[PDB]
């Protein structure tokens, strides 16, 4: 019966790996978004700098 | 390239507020050093 059981849970490992491929995908995509926000938010700040530079 | 330009305006100030004062102090001179206050100065200088 053991037997039969490990060849089974080898079609549920065969999924799991699609679930946790998708999972770090999400992740990718949302650290990538994280990202731009820091540049655009320095690029105002550096216009600030400048600015104040100026002044 | 703004502290640049701001940096070499501020050192003409600072040499023309410089190069005034020298030509005071260096009219004063003519009058001030005379052989009197020389002497005097050398035995002051020596006080210490």
Request: proline share 1%.
């Amino acid at each position: 019966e053991l037997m039969e059981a490990e060849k089974t849970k080898l079609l549920i490992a065969a999924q799991k790996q699609k679930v946790v491929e998708k999972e770090a995908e999400t992740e990718r995509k949302k650290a990538v978004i994280e990202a731009e926000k820091i540049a655009q938010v320095a690029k105002i700040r550096f216009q600030q700098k400048v600015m104040e530079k100026e002044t | 390239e703004i502290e640049d330009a701001a940096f070499l305006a501020r050192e003409k100030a600072k040499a023309d507020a410089e190069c005034y004062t020298a030509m005071k102090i260096a009219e004063a001179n003519k009058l001030k050093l005379t052989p009197e206050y020389l002497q005097l100065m050398k035995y002051k200088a020596i006080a210490s």
